[PDB]
């Protein structure tokens, strides 16, 4: 066979994993710093 | 009589508990170190107070340190697959709930450091809509403590 | 067929004495030197290369893999 | 020969579950990397504006 | 004696190299890439053979070393016209400045193009191919062969006892016509670039210790020449020793586990000796192969630190920037070991673009003007004349050009990369003397 | 026609390149009836190595007329040049 | 008795460790050489304070290397899998926590050195920021070495 | 005794450790060499020192290299798989490092060698930054060495 | 007795090496044509030496054919599985090296031709960048005639 | 007596070679119209000349046509298998190189006519690069045909 | 003998022959339509002769409805599979290679149009690129065709 | 002896005939409604001869009704499968060339009601050109036709 109980169930929750921490780095990469500051 | 690879889940919660609240915590500290560089240009006296949005943040990476080694000291090898997958949720129910809160906290803080150099009366508003982050990361550790032992 | 120790007697004694006598037999104007440069240098980069391609050849592993029309041909041919 | 199975890996969901997604994974860095690679900024600057 | 430039009479002086119509434009390729040090070693006395001699390795190919001699001989014979002459263009300009040059790379290619026996894809049979002697083939049991053949290749075996013997000049034409060419004459490229390569950098190095002595400087030979050409030779110049060595040694006799040059090149470094499953090319291999690994590890200390030690020490018994020092030499040393592997790889141009060269000529001659010939006579008499003609534009189009070009370049690149910078180092000025040279213009 | 002197010029170029060529070709065919071993053998091929060489000497012939139309290729862009 | 390819878990951990730590390094590197590039161009008095970020990025760096090195060094070929799981673990807790920290130090270094040479009184306050930065690294790399050992 | 299809790990590491440092150095080197050409034509008379990111992104794909080659005159047919295990670990561990390194000597050879044009002294500092990436890069070959003699 | 459809791999491998070099050499072309046609408009004069970018970045599609070649050559029925990793591995190795390679040289062919009419002091500098672009796919090179052989 | 589905690999070969090979001249067809018809406001006199990048197009959409017709003449029912990938690997070997080349006629030819345009002595600059992508595109004929046949 | 699903690929050869050149007739027929709705605001004259593309485009349409009728009329129920695959190859083959040419017909009679308002001259230079792209969709069912009765 | 799995197929293609041919005819009259109702503005005198668009994309919709139709009718339970196919093809041939054909349709009908508002001489252009997209479309219905009943 091509999975197990065992592959499977990991697979699964490797994904929902896998798309916390997909959501969190996403916020991360997409975070910028200022161009310029304010005044002296 | 223990399912193989019962183990493997369990461990996942560990390192989903520090690895999660860390990003949480790290996202935190960089949006609040930025508003910090910005404010403190112009108004220096503010550095102190205006540090408190990293400490926060940083407790958010303590409630996943916390959950992760608790984890990590329940691990053995022949686990029944029941217990690992309580250790599996606690871990992701610390590190998201942390992790979200983290999201909070940075955001808030950086407005909340700005607004504070703009008009001082802001201080305080600040300090309480950052507790309630706070509490929602201490929220996600009180139910990942419970989990682990039922 | 062939020998190999041939070769190398014509081929060395040709480019042998380009490179060693050649400098000797040289007009004594201004490009005496540029002369003398390039009769060694050409005898040694035209020796070496040809030396490889011939030592290459000897002992050789294995022949050539020819198609059965031409395995033909040349049956009738050489 | 008889209708015999020609003896399909035993074990074969780990080899391929390894395989599928260790090079599915590296394949995506590769995609990933070339695509950062193949757009880089070089500044549009300094003399861009004038060869432009 | 080697050619420097000449004296000029305490600030930098420029560079005065004398050139003539003939070297004048080897001398600019060579200022193409930097003005030499005041007194250093010209090397455009060795670029002009060294140079179309590494083009003719690339670009050996009789029948285009034809074309590209006939080229610079009628740009020669209307040097006169073309001169004295207006010529807005560039390109033209350019290649008739280059007239010269030119030149000799047509008469290097038509002598590497014979070696390689390689006109257009074709060999040249002088009769003397004697490779296998057919008649004994089928005696050495193959009965009707031909039967079978019908389908298969079958190839012939090495010491049946009725084959050998090297052709007089260039590889035998019987491998032209083989499918399994691609093997038998890739490794021979493969070998030969390696072994030029080397040669070349040992050369080049060589160069080097006659400019350290000019400049009366002991330390860069006793830390410098002589560290560096050791490790130089320890690793690479064994490297082509044993390949020599294999050609002669092994004969088909051994064909079955006969030693790889390559894994043991590396087991070399690596200090890999497996009980089994790679024979030794020679007895006692071993304890060479690991002394020389040795020695050029004890070369770099030499080269890497002993001299800005030694200056640090005169200088404080006299008694100068001893870190900065340290930290040039180190640099030195870094590149020049890493060069050194790196160099001897960028040789592998020379099969690169040698096996790209043939093989795109076989492919224009298959696709195109195989389509000239044919079963019928008055179609394929008139046919080959316009496919031929087709073939004839392609052949200058893609190869003539395109691919002389490559070779060009990549000739001229290891001329400047891997020889110059062997002992070629520094700058000068341009010699810009009043003159009245404008008279054209 | 002129055609333009610098068309003309390639053409006496190609000419005489391919007439050198082609008769060259046409030779090496007629003497080893070879390397090129590209006749268009039959593939009911029978006990006669007279065929090979009969399909050579075809081989050969062509070469030589596309030779001759080269010529008048010559002649031709050689006046070309010369009026031009 | 030990499952087969049990090794495979444990190797990837050791790799994902040094990859994640050198990943987050590199960014935080990446990021504070450009402000400081930016910042020291008008005020290179400052060019010997601002590398600091660079030198705590290193050490994200280095909690991999100690963690990559101390997987490594406990693999065999006989794993009984558990351990592997626990490897996998420890590797990504300490690689992908400093992955997480890399990006902390690299905004943080930006904003900071920039804003330092705005207003110089900022310095310390950039570096306390770095510190939590560099603390959640560690979190990183004390999970992985209470699970690598377990 | 040897599972076949072992060897595929393997051979994926010695081609991973020579193509993923490869687009490092190819970043590494493409990156600082858009800032060259905007420095030199500023000024030309630095052409010779703003080489250096080109020189650093070379040696990393060396790294890569080193155990691409390491690891292909390691492989076998009869493989005990283990070692494959180590071989692709140790392939990826040097070539995704070395990545990550090329990203980081890119960015700051293009922003030191901007900034240097117009501030000679940031030359100092944009070395010791270039030095932490090359670091960057070597525990990756550490590491890799590490597991592939493991 | 050797696993069935075994060349597979090695086929992919021979076509990988000159698909991805071609992809590689295809890339190098274009943008440095680009390059060239923007420049040569004010300085015609330079349009001989600007087309290097494009005469070296031919390399790569040479060793592909190179390796591609080199596979084929040993391509049989009867292939021991192993062996056609070893092609594979080699294929990709060449391909996506020379495809890193490709990149390098098109990115700084384009800065460098430009920049060279600016200021043609840039030539030195220049050919040594493309130098080490084109070093590496020689590294690709080296490690597919390593690995091809072995 | 081979697995049946054999002859599906040669099919997709010859169809990809025809496919890949006239997206490519598509593709440089498209960029060099879009150019040539701007150009042509300027300069109509060069419409003739500006064709050839056109022509290139052409030449790369029959090397593909070669090889699918010689992939669909050798392909048979009862295929060895074997040679049903090289046709597969020659198919794509051809196309996909083809492909790539397309991509590089175009954008040397809209660039180089442009740049025609504004500078008539760039037009012998661009027929050159053309030749280079053109035998890139030949490269991958030469593999196919290699392959094809083994 | 063959499997009763051995028609699928055939009748799916049919339906993509027709549908992929149907959609490249589209996108040139749309992108021409947008080209010459533009032009004839600039001038009447040209509408009448401006159709050409969207013939050109309607001739690529056909190409895949011969081939697509051919597959049609030859598939059967008692299919001998290899006929099926080169129908599958023969309809991909010449639909693909129809699209392709209905986007050089797209974008080259789009930019031809436009351009030919201002230069009438281009007319003819417009034809006869658009002629190329007619015979690189002839090229798709060339191939398809000897596919077919392959 | 009839498969149970090919009372799909059919009525898939029943489904994809109606589906697609809507989306298509939706397509084309969502733009030409659009570009109907600017053109309104300055020209209202057109609105009635400018439907025609609308009435060609509703056409597309008929030819994939009725083969739905077809196959609906033409649907049984003892289906051979065969048939099951080419109801399959016969569905997505009609309804994915008529989508294509709606997008010509859209995109024409657009661009040549807002070009016949100024230039009235593009009404009959329009109206050739929409005719060639009806005709695509019509391509689809007869291969359809052809499968249906095969």
Redesign the interface.
């Given at each position: 066979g091509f999975f197990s109980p065992g592959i499977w169930m990991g697979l699964l929750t490797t994904l929902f994993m896998l798309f916390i921490f997909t959501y969190g780095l996403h916020m991360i990469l997409s975070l910028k710093t200022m161009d310029r500051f304010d005044d002296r | 009589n223990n399912p193989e690879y019962s183990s493997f889940f369990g461990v996942m919660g560990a390192s989903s508990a520090m690895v999660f609240s860390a990003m949480g915590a790290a996202y935190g500290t960089a949006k609040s170190g930025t508003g910090i560089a910005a404010m403190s240009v112009m108004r220096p006296e503010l550095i102190m107070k205006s540090i408190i949005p990293v400490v926060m943040a940083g407790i958010i990476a303590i409630y996943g340190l916390v959950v992760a080694v608790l984890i990590a000291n329940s691990l053995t090898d022949g686990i029944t697959l029941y217990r690992s997958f309580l250790q599996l949720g606690a871990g992701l129910s610390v590190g998201l709930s942390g992790l979200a809160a983290g999201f909070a906290i940075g955001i808030v803080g950086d407005a909340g450091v700005r607004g504070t150099a703009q008009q001082p009366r802001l201080f305080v508003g600040m300090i309480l809509i950052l507790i309630f982050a706070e509490v929602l990361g201490l929220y996600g550790l009180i139910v990942a403590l419970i989990l682990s032992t039922k | 067929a062939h020998s190999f120790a041939l070769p190398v007697i014509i081929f060395t004694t040709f480019w042998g004495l380009i490179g060693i006598a050649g400098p000797w037999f040289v007009p004594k104007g201004p490009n005496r030197g540029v002369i003398i440069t390039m009769l060694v240098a050409t005898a040694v980069c035209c020796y070496l290369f040809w030396l490889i391609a011939i030592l290459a050849q000897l002992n050789p592993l294995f022949g050539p893999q020819l198609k059965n029309e031409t395995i033909w041909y040349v049956r009738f041919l050489w | 020969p008889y209708n015999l199975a020609?003896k399909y890996n035993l074990?074969?969901?780990?080899?391929?579950?390894?395989?599928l997604w260790?090079?599915t994974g590296?394949a995506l860095?590769?995609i990933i990397?070339?695509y950062?690679?193949?757009n880089?900024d070089?500044?549009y600057?300094?003399?861009?504006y004038?060869?432009? | 004696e080697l050619f420097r430039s000449e004296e000029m009479t305490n600030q930098t002086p420029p560079t005065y190299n004398k050139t003539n119509k003939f070297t004048h434009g080897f001398q600019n390729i060579v200022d193409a890439y930097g003005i030499g040090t005041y007194r250093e070693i010209n090397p455009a006395p060795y670029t002009v053979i060294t140079f179309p001699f590494l083009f003719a390795v690339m670009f050996g190919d009789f029948g285009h070393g034809i074309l590209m001699t006939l080229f610079a001989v009628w740009m020669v014979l209307r040097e006169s016209r073309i001169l004295s002459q207006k010529n807005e263009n560039e390109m033209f300009s350019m290649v008739f400045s280059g007239r010269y040059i030119i030149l000799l790379m047509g008469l290097f290619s038509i002598y590497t193009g014979l070696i390689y026996n390689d006109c257009f894809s074709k060999s040249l049979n002088i009769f003397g191919s004697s490779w296998s002697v057919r008649p004994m083939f089928t005696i050495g049991n193959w009965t009707e062969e031909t039967l079978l053949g019908s389908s298969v290749l079958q190839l012939n075996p090495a010491i049946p006892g009725v084959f050998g013997g090297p052709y007089p000049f260039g590889i035998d034409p019987i491998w032209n016509i083989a499918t399994n060419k691609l093997t038998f004459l890739n490794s021979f490229k493969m070998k030969m670039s390696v072994i030029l390569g080397i040669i070349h950098m040992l050369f080049g190095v060589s160069l080097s210790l006659f400019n350290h002595i000019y400049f009366k400087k002991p330390l860069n030979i006793y830390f410098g020449f002589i560290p560096e050409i050791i490790f130089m030779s320890s690793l690479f110049g064994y490297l082509v020793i044993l390949i020599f060595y294999k050609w002669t040694a092994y004969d088909a006799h051994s064909s079955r586990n006969a030693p790889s040059l390559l894994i043991h090149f590396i087991n070399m470094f690596l200090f890999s000796y497996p009980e089994s499953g790679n024979a030794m090319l020679y007895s006692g291999q071993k304890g060479i192969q690991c002394f020389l690994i040795v020695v050029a590890m004890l070369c770099v200390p030499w080269m890497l630190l002993f001299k800005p030690l030694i200056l640090r020490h005169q200088y404080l018994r006299k008694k100068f920037d001893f870190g900065d020092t340290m930290v040039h030499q180190a640099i030195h040393t870094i590149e020049y070991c890493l060069g050194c592997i790196s160099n001897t790889a960028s040789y592998l141009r020379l099969w690169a673009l040698s096996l790209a060269h043939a093989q795109l000529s076989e492919v224009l001659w298959t696709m195109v003007i195989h389509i000239g010939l044919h079963v019928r006579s008055l179609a394929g008499g008139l046919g080959l004349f316009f496919i031929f003609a087709a073939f004839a534009t392609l052949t200058v189009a893609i190869l003539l050009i395109m691919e002389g070009l490559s070779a060009f370049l990549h000739a001229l690149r290891l001329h400047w990369v891997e020889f110059q910078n062997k002992f070629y180092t520094g700058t000068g000025f341009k010699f810009l003397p009043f003159s009245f040279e404008h008279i054209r213009e | 026609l002129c055609c333009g002197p610098k068309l003309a010029a390639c053409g006496i170029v190609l000419s005489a390149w391919g007439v050198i060529m082609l008769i060259m070709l046409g030779i090496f065919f007629n003497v080893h009836s070879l390397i090129e071993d590209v006749p268009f053998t039959e593939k009911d091929f029978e006990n006669g190595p007279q065929n090979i060489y009969n399909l050579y000497e075809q081989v050969s012939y062509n070469c030589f007329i596309a030779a001759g139309l080269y010529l008048l290729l010559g002649g031709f862009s050689f006046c070309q040049v010369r009026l031009n």
């Open positions: - | - | - | 020609y074990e074969y969901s780990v080899v391929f579950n390894l395989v260790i090079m590296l860095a590769v990397t070339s950062n690679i193949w880089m070089p500044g600057d300094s003399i861009i004038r060869m432009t | - | -």
